[PDB]
Each structure stands twice: as structure tokens, then as C-alpha cells.
């Protein structure tokens, strides 16, 4: 640059930061409003969810999004599910100067929907040629504007202000004629999003979700069986492909605790978590899958350095309600069920559906926190792939560098206290059999536990 | 190296030794860079016996240093 003393001030996030959030979650959702056919990330502010997908609790989108956000996920990734017939609302405007009136402007909702987004056009009381363009939803006004009677400036203004973000205006003809007055005319022709949604839509959503990486998946708070087996196979495929995705599920409200335990027996992969209990938060019930959304969100928000075996929930009630016998039955079945151990609703344990089996996949694998730990180690290691694969020569120096980097990572874990003991070394047994263009290595560790049970004995 | 050695040294033991020494120096330079893990370069006495007096035969083995394409890890907890 030219000589001088040029300041460039950077007080954007000086101390406006907090560290109370973590994790990311996947969400196929049915929605009346918002983008369609894309996987969109949502920051934890619910205002973003409300803006980008509406505020209708009749739909899985807003309700499950609110539950996930209250789960304190750092970034919530959504995908709007639709049938192919799903459509945008639309309205058309016409001129009045000519006896044979001609359509000159068309209004269409910015996102596909079927809501009653309405529009009003009336004569401007100040200027003769101006028309006052006002927009509503069921007469609840969104935005008002006034432009002279030329179509180009009218559509440009209507598309300019983001107060009119609900609707897009397009020019039908290049007229300079006075528009026709409308009063609360709905943008018709749209279709909602709950229309004929089937397993194929969920399959397409999952195929879209293959692109990204996630900490957990919950399947739209829907307990349809065939979707559950499909997602089970999909997660198994993703695991075999090096994508370590965890899955939470919730049974149907009609299922008895015996049926829920049978389903939790049917699932035995460690990445499957079955939720049995229903709950109420704002005096409104939530099916086991709807609360499975929340428990998955809370789990991913916990991340490492935590668990869920007694994490307090937002729910004001829980049902069905279990004695210690029923709780033990559910845990032995691998079911996760909420509890009312105190005046609040409390998560009973960290169990997953796998826990029915014991020894080879160890008992700690029956707990979700260990699976999150293993998936995190696999993810960081598969991040190291690109640092080390195809970039170092397999000699003693390259092996030493790889081992030193992994040792530094595990020592960082040790510094956090997550691991009580570890060692990582070359797998000389397999390294002897290794081909010259490959490397084998081994590591042992001991994750630091957490009190689930405590016992006290008193003397007087 | 052809232009350095062809038509400029007499095919005697001295010339063969000089050629072999130069090639050895080159391969040792490669070794110093670590590109080669092992090598040897020597006169091709099998073909040198059949070689005409105005020509030279030589042999060399080497082992290029590989790179990780595949890596596998196994975990214990």
C-alpha cells in the first residue's frame, strides 16, 4: 500500500463469547415453511429456527427443533421433507387503466408452504398514482409499502425490503398502468408439507444427509418401524464407510414397556438408542421419539467430559412411570427411559440398546458416553488421515512422527483428565505382516469413569 | 551421464571404476535425500563378459521409499 498509518479496528467479538454449547445433530423434518431439498445448518438461537422454518407447533420441524435447541446443540442441521406435489403459494395482480386488464405482477411465497399469507393493495391517500402494498398472514400484517403506478419500481421495492421476505414479486408484463386493488388476498396454489409423506421421502433425506458429518441422528421423532430398520442399515453402512454416526430412536406411544424392551432387544448395535418414556414440557405430551430428539441433543451437547445418567431434563412430567423393578428390566433390555427421581424429570442412565450383550463389546460400550468417546477418537484419527496418508515415507522417521502426533493427541486428552491411563505404540505384530505402503499401530486407554452408584454406611 | 562418459574414457578397469563411482555417488545423493531405502550398483559381469570391447554393461538394484496410502488402527479401552 501507500505509506501511512492505516488503522483497521476489529472489536467484533472482543468478549461477547461463551462456551456453553457443543455438538451437531441431524434432523429430517416436516415443515409448513422454509427451504426444501437442502440440508441447512441452524445456530442454537431459536429465532433462527422460527425465521427459517416458521413457528407452527403442529409440525415436526418447529417442535423438534425447539427440543433440540433446548438440548443445547451448537449447530442444528435440518432438512425439510416433502412430497413431490408440495408447492409454493401464489397470487397475481392486474392493471386497471385498460378495459382489457392484463396481469402485470405475480406474488409467490419465498418458501414452499400452504399458509394463508395475504396481501392488500389500496389507493394511496397522499399521492394519486401510488398504491399502498400491505402484506399479512391471516390478517396479521407483515409489511406495508407505497410505490407509484409503474410496475418495475413496484416489483423492485416489493423485492427490496427484507420485511417482505415472506414473498417474492415478479413482473408479468412491462406496464406503466395503475394496479388493481386487492384486500387480504391469500397467495393460493401452495401445498403444505405434511401431504403424503412416506418412507421414500425419509430415504431421500438420509441420502442427502450422507454428505455431512454428525454427532447423532434421531429420525424426525417418528417411530415407524420400516424407517427404523432402514436407518439402522444406513448407519451401519456409514460406520463401515468411516462415518461414525450415532442413532437415537423412540418407540411408539402404544407400545407397552414389554414391547419397548423387545424392540430394545431387537436393536443391539451400539449406535442404536431406544427411548421408551413419554414426557410433557409445556403441558404438551411428547412421544418417545419426540423426546428421543431431546435426549440425543443433550447427549451431543454433553460431548466428552460428561454423561446423561442423571442429567436434569426440561420436562415437567414423564410417563409411563417405573418402579425399580421396571427400571432394571428396561436397563437390562438396553432401553433408555426417563425418571422422576425428584420433583423434576431426570434421565435414569447412560444405557443404549446394545447393553443386552456384555463381554466382547464391553459393558462400557453399553453406555452412550463411551460410544461418543470412541466415535470422537475415530473421527480425530480419520482427520489425521489427510495429514499423514500419502505425505510421509513409511520409514522409521515417518512412523515416529505419526506415533509422536498420536501421543501428543492422547496426552492432550490426558491433560483434560478424560483418560486415566494410556499407551500408544506401533503394532509390530501386524507391522511385520504389513505391506510396504501401509502402517499398523495399536493403543490402549482407560476412560475416566463417573459415579452412577454410591453407597454410604453410618456409625453413631 | 552419457555425454560425460561415452566416447571420453577408455573402457579399461579405470574407466569402468570411474563410471561406477560416479553412479554410486549419484545413488548415494539419492540415499541422502531418503528417496531410496536400499540400493547397490555394480558392473553387469554376465553381460560384460559378452560385451564387445567398445561397450559397457552395468546393473543396479534399488528400493524406493514408500508412502502411506492405507493406515489401520485398533483400539483398547
Coordinates of C-alpha atoms in Angstrom, one line a residue:
Chain A
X1 CA 0.0 0.0 0.0
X2 CA 0.9 3.7 0.0
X3 CA 2.9 4.9 3.0
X4 CA 0.8 5.9 6.0
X5 CA -0.5 4.7 9.3
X6 CA -3.8 3.0 8.5
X7 CA -5.9 1.6 11.4
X8 CA -8.4 -1.3 10.9
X9 CA -10.4 -1.8 14.1
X10 CA -11.5 -5.3 15.0
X11 CA -13.7 -5.1 18.1
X12 CA -16.3 -7.6 16.7
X13 CA -16.2 -10.4 19.3
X14 CA -14.0 -8.9 22.0
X15 CA -15.6 -10.6 25.0
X16 CA -19.1 -11.5 23.6
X17 CA -18.3 -15.2 23.7
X18 CA -19.4 -18.2 25.8
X19 CA -18.6 -21.9 25.8
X20 CA -21.9 -23.5 26.9
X21 CA -22.6 -25.3 23.6
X22 CA -21.3 -28.2 21.7
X23 CA -22.2 -30.9 19.2
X24 CA -24.2 -31.1 16.0
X25 CA -27.3 -33.0 15.1
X26 CA -29.2 -34.2 12.0
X27 CA -32.9 -33.6 11.5
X28 CA -35.3 -34.7 8.8
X29 CA -38.4 -32.5 9.4
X30 CA -41.8 -31.9 8.1
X31 CA -42.5 -28.2 7.9
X32 CA -45.1 -25.7 6.7
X33 CA -42.4 -23.1 5.9
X34 CA -38.8 -22.9 5.0
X35 CA -36.3 -24.2 2.4
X36 CA -36.9 -27.5 0.7
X37 CA -34.5 -30.1 -0.6
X38 CA -31.4 -28.8 1.2
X39 CA -29.6 -29.6 4.5
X40 CA -29.4 -26.2 6.3
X41 CA -27.5 -25.6 9.5
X42 CA -29.2 -23.7 12.3
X43 CA -27.4 -21.9 15.1
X44 CA -28.8 -22.5 18.6
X45 CA -30.9 -19.3 18.6
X46 CA -34.5 -20.5 18.2
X47 CA -35.2 -17.2 16.5
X48 CA -33.2 -18.6 13.5
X49 CA -35.4 -21.7 13.5
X50 CA -38.6 -19.5 13.8
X51 CA -37.5 -17.4 10.9
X52 CA -36.3 -20.1 8.6
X53 CA -39.0 -22.8 9.2
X54 CA -41.9 -20.9 10.9
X55 CA -43.3 -21.2 14.4
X56 CA -46.1 -23.8 13.9
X57 CA -46.0 -26.5 16.7
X58 CA -48.4 -28.7 14.6
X59 CA -45.3 -29.8 12.6
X60 CA -42.3 -31.9 13.5
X61 CA -40.0 -29.1 12.4
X62 CA -40.6 -26.3 14.9
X63 CA -41.4 -28.7 17.9
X64 CA -38.4 -31.0 17.4
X65 CA -36.2 -28.0 16.6
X66 CA -37.1 -26.3 19.9
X67 CA -36.5 -29.6 21.8
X68 CA -33.0 -29.9 20.1
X69 CA -32.1 -26.3 20.8
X70 CA -33.1 -26.7 24.4
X71 CA -30.7 -29.7 24.2
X72 CA -28.0 -27.1 23.7
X73 CA -26.6 -28.3 20.4
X74 CA -24.0 -25.9 18.9
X75 CA -25.5 -26.2 15.4
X76 CA -28.7 -28.0 14.4
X77 CA -28.8 -29.3 10.9
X78 CA -32.3 -29.6 9.4
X79 CA -33.8 -31.0 6.2
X80 CA -37.4 -30.3 5.1
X81 CA -39.3 -33.4 4.0
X82 CA -41.9 -33.0 1.3
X83 CA -43.9 -35.0 -1.3
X84 CA -43.3 -34.0 -4.9
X85 CA -46.6 -32.3 -5.1
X86 CA -45.5 -29.8 -2.3
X87 CA -45.8 -26.3 -3.7
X88 CA -45.5 -22.5 -3.1
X89 CA -48.4 -20.2 -2.6
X90 CA -49.0 -17.7 -5.3
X91 CA -51.1 -14.6 -6.1
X92 CA -51.4 -12.5 -9.3
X93 CA -52.0 -8.8 -9.8
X94 CA -53.6 -6.9 -12.7
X95 CA -53.8 -3.4 -14.1
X96 CA -56.9 -1.2 -14.3
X97 CA -56.0 1.5 -16.8
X98 CA -57.0 -0.7 -19.7
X99 CA -60.5 -2.1 -20.1
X100 CA -59.0 -5.4 -21.1
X101 CA -57.0 -5.7 -17.9
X102 CA -53.6 -7.5 -18.2
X103 CA -51.7 -9.4 -15.5
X104 CA -48.6 -7.4 -14.7
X105 CA -47.2 -8.6 -11.3
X106 CA -47.2 -12.1 -9.6
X107 CA -46.5 -12.7 -5.9
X108 CA -45.2 -16.0 -4.7
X109 CA -44.1 -17.1 -1.3
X110 CA -40.4 -17.2 -0.8
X111 CA -40.6 -20.7 0.5
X112 CA -43.0 -23.6 -0.3
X113 CA -46.0 -23.6 2.0
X114 CA -49.8 -23.7 2.2
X115 CA -50.3 -21.0 4.8
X116 CA -52.7 -18.1 4.3
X117 CA -50.1 -15.4 3.5
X118 CA -52.3 -12.5 2.4
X119 CA -51.8 -9.2 0.5
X120 CA -53.7 -5.9 0.3
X121 CA -53.4 -3.2 -2.3
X122 CA -55.3 0.1 -2.0
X123 CA -55.2 3.6 -3.4
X124 CA -52.6 5.9 -1.8
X125 CA -54.3 8.7 0.1
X126 CA -51.4 11.2 -0.4
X127 CA -50.2 10.6 -4.0
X128 CA -52.7 9.9 -6.8
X129 CA -50.8 7.3 -8.7
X130 CA -49.4 5.5 -5.7
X131 CA -50.8 2.2 -4.4
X132 CA -50.2 1.1 -0.8
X133 CA -49.0 -2.5 -0.8
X134 CA -49.6 -4.3 2.5
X135 CA -48.9 -7.9 3.4
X136 CA -50.4 -10.2 6.1
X137 CA -50.7 -13.8 7.3
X138 CA -54.3 -14.4 8.3
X139 CA -54.7 -10.6 8.5
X140 CA -51.6 -10.3 10.8
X141 CA -49.7 -7.6 9.0
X142 CA -46.1 -8.3 7.9
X143 CA -45.1 -5.2 5.9
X144 CA -46.5 -2.1 4.2
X145 CA -45.2 0.0 1.4
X146 CA -46.3 2.5 -1.2
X147 CA -44.9 3.0 -4.8
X148 CA -46.1 5.0 -7.8
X149 CA -48.0 3.2 -10.5
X150 CA -45.1 1.8 -12.6
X151 CA -44.7 -1.9 -12.4
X152 CA -40.9 -2.1 -12.4
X153 CA -40.4 0.1 -9.4
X154 CA -43.3 -1.6 -7.6
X155 CA -41.8 -5.1 -8.0
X156 CA -38.3 -3.8 -7.2
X157 CA -39.5 -2.2 -4.0
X158 CA -41.5 -5.3 -3.0
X159 CA -38.4 -7.5 -3.6
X160 CA -36.0 -4.9 -2.0
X161 CA -37.1 -4.7 1.7
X162 CA -36.4 -7.8 3.7
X163 CA -39.5 -7.0 5.7
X164 CA -41.2 -8.6 2.6
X165 CA -39.0 -11.7 2.9
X166 CA -42.1 -14.0 3.1
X167 CA -42.9 -13.3 -0.6
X168 CA -41.2 -12.7 -3.9
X169 CA -42.6 -10.4 -6.6
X170 CA -42.0 -10.9 -10.3
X171 CA -43.0 -8.8 -13.3
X172 CA -45.5 -10.4 -15.6
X173 CA -45.6 -7.5 -18.1
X174 CA -43.8 -4.2 -18.7
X175 CA -46.8 -1.9 -17.9
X176 CA -46.9 1.6 -16.6
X177 CA -50.6 1.2 -15.7
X178 CA -52.5 1.6 -12.4
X179 CA -52.7 -1.7 -10.5
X180 CA -55.9 -3.3 -9.3
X181 CA -56.8 -3.1 -5.6
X182 CA -56.8 -6.3 -3.6
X183 CA -57.7 -6.8 0.1
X184 CA -56.2 -9.6 2.1
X185 CA -56.0 -12.0 -0.9
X186 CA -54.2 -15.2 0.0
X187 CA -51.2 -16.5 -2.0
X188 CA -53.1 -19.6 -3.1
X189 CA -51.8 -22.6 -5.0
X190 CA -49.4 -23.8 -2.3
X191 CA -49.1 -27.1 -0.6
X192 CA -48.2 -27.8 2.9
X193 CA -45.5 -30.4 3.6
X194 CA -47.5 -33.0 5.6
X195 CA -49.0 -34.1 2.3
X196 CA -48.4 -37.9 1.7
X197 CA -45.0 -38.1 3.3
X198 CA -43.8 -41.7 3.2
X199 CA -40.6 -43.7 3.7
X200 CA -39.2 -42.7 0.4
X201 CA -39.0 -39.0 1.5
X202 CA -37.1 -40.1 4.6
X203 CA -34.8 -42.2 2.4
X204 CA -34.0 -39.3 0.1
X205 CA -33.4 -37.1 3.2
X206 CA -30.9 -39.6 4.6
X207 CA -29.2 -39.8 1.2
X208 CA -28.8 -36.0 1.3
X209 CA -27.6 -36.3 4.9
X210 CA -24.8 -38.7 3.7
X211 CA -22.9 -35.6 2.6
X212 CA -22.4 -34.2 6.1
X213 CA -20.9 -35.3 9.4
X214 CA -22.9 -35.6 12.6
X215 CA -22.8 -36.5 16.2
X216 CA -26.2 -38.1 16.3
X217 CA -29.4 -38.8 14.3
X218 CA -33.0 -39.1 15.6
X219 CA -35.2 -39.7 12.6
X220 CA -37.8 -36.9 12.8
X221 CA -39.3 -38.0 16.0
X222 CA -41.2 -40.7 14.1
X223 CA -41.3 -44.4 15.3
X224 CA -42.3 -46.1 12.1
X225 CA -40.6 -49.5 12.1
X226 CA -39.5 -49.8 8.4
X227 CA -37.9 -46.4 8.6
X228 CA -36.1 -47.6 11.8
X229 CA -34.6 -50.7 10.1
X230 CA -33.7 -48.5 7.0
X231 CA -31.9 -46.0 9.2
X232 CA -30.2 -48.9 11.1
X233 CA -28.8 -50.3 7.9
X234 CA -27.9 -46.8 6.8
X235 CA -25.9 -46.1 10.0
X236 CA -24.2 -49.4 9.7
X237 CA -23.2 -48.6 6.1
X238 CA -21.9 -45.1 7.3
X239 CA -19.9 -46.8 10.1
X240 CA -18.3 -49.2 7.6
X241 CA -17.6 -46.2 5.3
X242 CA -15.7 -44.5 8.1
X243 CA -18.5 -42.1 9.2
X244 CA -19.3 -42.7 12.9
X245 CA -22.9 -41.6 13.2
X246 CA -24.8 -42.4 16.4
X247 CA -28.6 -43.0 16.2
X248 CA -31.3 -42.4 18.8
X249 CA -34.8 -43.9 18.5
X250 CA -38.1 -43.9 20.3
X251 CA -40.8 -46.4 20.3
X252 CA -44.5 -45.8 19.7
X253 CA -46.7 -44.5 22.4
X254 CA -48.9 -47.6 22.1
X255 CA -46.0 -49.9 22.9
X256 CA -46.0 -51.4 26.4
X257 CA -42.8 -51.4 28.4
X258 CA -42.5 -55.1 27.4
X259 CA -42.8 -54.2 23.7
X260 CA -40.3 -51.3 24.1
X261 CA -37.9 -53.8 25.8
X262 CA -38.4 -56.2 23.0
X263 CA -37.6 -53.6 20.5
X264 CA -34.5 -52.5 22.5
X265 CA -33.5 -56.2 22.4
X266 CA -34.0 -56.3 18.6
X267 CA -31.6 -53.4 18.4
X268 CA -28.1 -54.5 19.6
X269 CA -25.8 -52.3 17.6
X270 CA -24.0 -49.9 19.9
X271 CA -25.0 -46.9 17.8
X272 CA -28.7 -47.5 18.5
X273 CA -30.5 -46.0 21.5
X274 CA -34.2 -46.8 22.1
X275 CA -36.3 -44.4 24.1
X276 CA -39.5 -45.7 25.9
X277 CA -40.7 -42.9 28.1
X278 CA -43.0 -40.1 27.0
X279 CA -43.0 -36.6 28.6
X280 CA -44.5 -33.2 28.9
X281 CA -42.6 -29.9 28.8
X282 CA -45.1 -27.1 28.2
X283 CA -48.1 -29.1 29.4
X284 CA -47.9 -30.9 26.0
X285 CA -47.1 -34.5 25.6
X286 CA -44.1 -35.8 23.6
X287 CA -43.9 -39.3 22.2
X288 CA -40.8 -41.4 23.0
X289 CA -39.2 -40.4 19.7
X290 CA -40.0 -36.7 20.2
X291 CA -38.1 -36.9 23.5
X292 CA -35.5 -39.0 21.8
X293 CA -34.8 -35.9 19.8
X294 CA -34.2 -34.0 23.0
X295 CA -32.1 -36.8 24.6
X296 CA -29.9 -37.1 21.5
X297 CA -29.5 -33.3 21.5
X298 CA -28.5 -33.3 25.2
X299 CA -26.1 -36.1 24.6
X300 CA -24.3 -34.4 21.8
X301 CA -24.2 -31.2 23.7
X302 CA -22.6 -33.0 26.6
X303 CA -19.9 -34.3 24.3
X304 CA -16.9 -35.8 26.1
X305 CA -16.3 -34.8 29.7
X306 CA -19.8 -35.7 30.7
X307 CA -22.7 -38.1 30.5
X308 CA -26.5 -38.2 30.8
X309 CA -27.1 -40.8 33.6
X310 CA -28.6 -38.1 35.9
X311 CA -28.8 -35.0 33.7
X312 CA -31.8 -32.9 34.5
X313 CA -34.4 -32.6 31.8
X314 CA -36.7 -29.7 30.9
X315 CA -39.8 -31.9 31.0
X316 CA -42.4 -31.2 33.7
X317 CA -43.9 -34.7 33.6
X318 CA -42.9 -38.2 32.5
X319 CA -44.9 -41.3 31.7
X320 CA -45.1 -44.3 31.9
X321 CA -43.6 -44.4 35.4
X322 CA -41.5 -47.2 36.6
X323 CA -40.6 -48.9 39.9
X324 CA -37.0 -50.0 40.4
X325 CA -38.0 -53.5 39.1
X326 CA -39.3 -51.9 35.8
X327 CA -36.2 -49.6 35.6
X328 CA -33.9 -52.6 36.0
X329 CA -35.9 -54.5 33.4
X330 CA -35.6 -51.6 30.9
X331 CA -31.9 -51.2 31.6
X332 CA -31.2 -54.9 31.1
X333 CA -33.2 -54.6 27.9
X334 CA -31.0 -51.7 26.8
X335 CA -33.9 -49.3 26.9
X336 CA -33.4 -45.7 28.0
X337 CA -36.3 -44.3 30.0
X338 CA -36.7 -41.0 31.8
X339 CA -37.5 -41.0 35.5
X340 CA -39.0 -38.8 38.2
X341 CA -36.4 -39.4 40.9
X342 CA -37.1 -35.9 42.3
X343 CA -39.6 -33.2 41.6
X344 CA -38.2 -32.8 38.1
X345 CA -37.9 -35.4 35.3
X346 CA -34.4 -37.0 35.3
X347 CA -32.6 -39.3 32.9
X348 CA -32.2 -42.6 34.5
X349 CA -28.9 -43.9 33.0
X350 CA -26.5 -43.8 30.0
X351 CA -27.6 -47.1 28.5
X352 CA -28.0 -48.0 24.8
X353 CA -29.8 -50.8 23.1
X354 CA -26.6 -52.8 22.8
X355 CA -26.3 -53.3 26.6
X356 CA -28.3 -56.5 26.4
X357 CA -25.0 -58.2 25.4
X358 CA -22.0 -58.0 27.7
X359 CA -18.4 -59.1 27.2
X360 CA -16.9 -58.8 23.7
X361 CA -18.2 -55.3 23.1
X362 CA -17.6 -54.5 26.7
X363 CA -20.1 -53.3 29.3
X364 CA -18.8 -49.7 28.9
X365 CA -19.9 -49.9 25.2
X366 CA -23.4 -50.4 26.6
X367 CA -23.1 -46.8 27.8
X368 CA -23.6 -43.9 25.3
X369 CA -20.7 -41.8 26.6
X370 CA -18.1 -44.5 25.8
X371 CA -19.5 -44.7 22.2
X372 CA -19.3 -41.0 21.9
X373 CA -15.7 -41.2 23.1
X374 CA -14.8 -43.9 20.6
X375 CA -16.5 -42.1 17.8
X376 CA -14.6 -39.0 18.6
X377 CA -11.3 -40.8 18.7
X378 CA -12.1 -42.4 15.3
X379 CA -13.1 -39.0 13.9
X380 CA -10.0 -37.2 15.0
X381 CA -7.9 -40.2 13.7
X382 CA -9.7 -40.1 10.4
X383 CA -8.9 -36.4 10.4
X384 CA -5.2 -37.2 10.8
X385 CA -5.6 -39.5 7.7
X386 CA -5.2 -36.5 5.4
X387 CA -2.2 -35.2 7.4
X388 CA -0.4 -38.5 7.1
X389 CA -1.7 -40.6 4.2
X390 CA 0.3 -40.1 1.0
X391 CA 2.6 -37.5 2.6
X392 CA 5.3 -39.3 4.6
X393 CA 7.6 -42.1 3.5
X394 CA 6.8 -45.1 5.8
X395 CA 10.4 -45.0 7.0
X396 CA 11.3 -45.1 10.7
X397 CA 11.1 -41.2 10.7
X398 CA 7.5 -41.2 9.3
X399 CA 6.3 -43.9 11.7
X400 CA 7.9 -42.0 14.6
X401 CA 6.3 -38.7 13.5
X402 CA 2.9 -40.4 13.3
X403 CA 3.3 -42.0 16.7
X404 CA 4.5 -38.7 18.2
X405 CA 1.5 -36.9 16.8
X406 CA -0.9 -39.5 18.2
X407 CA 0.9 -39.4 21.5
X408 CA 0.5 -35.7 21.6
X409 CA -3.2 -36.0 21.0
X410 CA -3.6 -38.6 23.7
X411 CA -1.5 -36.5 26.1
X412 CA -3.9 -33.6 25.4
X413 CA -6.7 -36.0 26.3
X414 CA -4.8 -36.9 29.5
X415 CA -4.4 -33.2 30.4
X416 CA -8.2 -32.9 30.2
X417 CA -8.4 -35.8 32.6
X418 CA -10.7 -37.8 30.3
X419 CA -8.2 -40.7 30.2
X420 CA -6.7 -42.1 33.4
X421 CA -4.0 -44.3 31.6
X422 CA -3.0 -44.9 28.0
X423 CA -0.2 -46.2 25.8
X424 CA 0.1 -46.0 22.0
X425 CA 2.7 -47.9 20.0
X426 CA 3.4 -49.5 16.7
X427 CA 1.6 -52.7 16.0
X428 CA 4.8 -54.7 15.4
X429 CA 2.8 -57.9 15.1
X430 CA 0.8 -56.6 12.1
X431 CA 3.6 -54.2 11.0
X432 CA 5.7 -57.3 10.3
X433 CA 3.0 -58.6 8.0
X434 CA 2.2 -55.1 6.7
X435 CA 2.8 -54.3 3.1
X436 CA 5.5 -51.7 2.4
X437 CA 2.9 -48.9 1.5
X438 CA 0.9 -49.2 4.8
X439 CA 1.2 -48.8 8.6
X440 CA -0.3 -50.6 11.6
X441 CA -0.4 -49.2 15.1
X442 CA -2.0 -50.0 18.5
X443 CA -3.2 -48.1 21.5
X444 CA -4.7 -48.9 24.9
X445 CA -6.5 -46.4 27.1
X446 CA -8.7 -46.2 30.2
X447 CA -11.5 -43.7 30.1
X448 CA -12.2 -41.9 33.4
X449 CA -15.4 -43.2 34.9
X450 CA -18.3 -41.3 36.6
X451 CA -20.3 -42.1 39.7
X452 CA -23.5 -43.9 38.8
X453 CA -23.9 -45.8 42.1
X454 CA -22.8 -44.5 45.5
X455 CA -23.1 -46.3 48.9
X456 CA -22.7 -44.9 52.4
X457 CA -22.5 -46.6 55.8
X458 CA -23.0 -44.8 59.1
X459 CA -21.7 -45.2 62.6
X460 CA -23.1 -43.5 65.7
Chain B
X1 CA 25.8 -39.0 -17.9
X2 CA 26.0 -40.5 -21.5
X3 CA 27.8 -37.3 -22.8
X4 CA 30.1 -37.3 -19.8
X5 CA 31.2 -40.9 -20.3
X6 CA 30.5 -42.0 -23.9
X7 CA 33.5 -41.5 -26.2
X8 CA 35.6 -40.0 -23.5
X9 CA 37.1 -42.9 -21.3
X10 CA 38.9 -45.9 -22.4
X11 CA 36.8 -48.9 -21.2
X12 CA 39.7 -50.1 -19.1
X13 CA 39.3 -51.0 -15.4
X14 CA 39.9 -47.4 -14.6
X15 CA 37.1 -46.1 -16.8
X16 CA 34.7 -48.7 -15.6
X17 CA 35.6 -47.9 -12.0
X18 CA 35.1 -44.1 -12.6
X19 CA 31.7 -44.7 -14.2
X20 CA 30.7 -47.0 -11.3
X21 CA 31.9 -44.4 -8.8
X22 CA 30.0 -41.6 -10.4
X23 CA 26.8 -43.6 -10.5
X24 CA 27.4 -44.7 -6.9
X25 CA 27.8 -41.0 -5.9
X26 CA 24.5 -40.2 -7.6
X27 CA 22.7 -43.0 -5.9
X28 CA 24.2 -42.0 -2.6
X29 CA 23.0 -38.5 -3.2
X30 CA 19.5 -40.1 -3.7
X31 CA 20.0 -42.1 -0.4
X32 CA 20.9 -38.9 1.4
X33 CA 17.5 -37.4 0.3
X34 CA 15.9 -40.6 1.8
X35 CA 14.2 -41.4 -1.5
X36 CA 15.9 -44.8 -1.6
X37 CA 15.9 -47.2 1.4
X38 CA 18.5 -49.6 -0.1
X39 CA 20.5 -49.9 -3.3
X40 CA 23.5 -51.5 -4.9
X41 CA 25.1 -50.7 -8.3
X42 CA 27.7 -52.9 -9.9
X43 CA 29.2 -54.0 -13.2
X44 CA 27.0 -56.5 -15.1
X45 CA 29.7 -59.1 -15.4
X46 CA 27.3 -61.5 -17.0
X47 CA 26.8 -59.2 -19.9
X48 CA 30.2 -57.6 -19.6
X49 CA 31.7 -61.0 -20.5
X50 CA 29.7 -61.0 -23.7
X51 CA 30.2 -57.2 -24.2
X52 CA 32.1 -56.0 -27.2
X53 CA 35.3 -54.2 -26.4
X54 CA 33.8 -50.7 -27.3
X55 CA 30.9 -51.0 -24.9
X56 CA 30.0 -51.4 -21.2
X57 CA 27.2 -53.1 -19.2
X58 CA 26.2 -52.4 -15.6
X59 CA 23.4 -53.3 -13.2
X60 CA 21.8 -51.7 -10.2
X61 CA 19.1 -52.6 -7.7
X62 CA 17.2 -50.1 -5.5
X63 CA 14.3 -49.8 -3.1
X64 CA 12.2 -46.6 -3.4
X65 CA 10.9 -45.4 -0.1
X66 CA 7.2 -45.9 0.1
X67 CA 4.4 -43.7 1.4
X68 CA 1.3 -44.4 3.5
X69 CA -1.7 -45.0 1.3
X70 CA -3.5 -47.2 3.7
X71 CA -3.5 -47.0 7.5
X72 CA -5.2 -49.1 10.1
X73 CA -5.7 -48.6 13.9
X74 CA -7.0 -50.8 16.6
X75 CA -8.2 -49.5 20.0
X76 CA -8.3 -50.9 23.5
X77 CA -10.2 -49.4 26.4

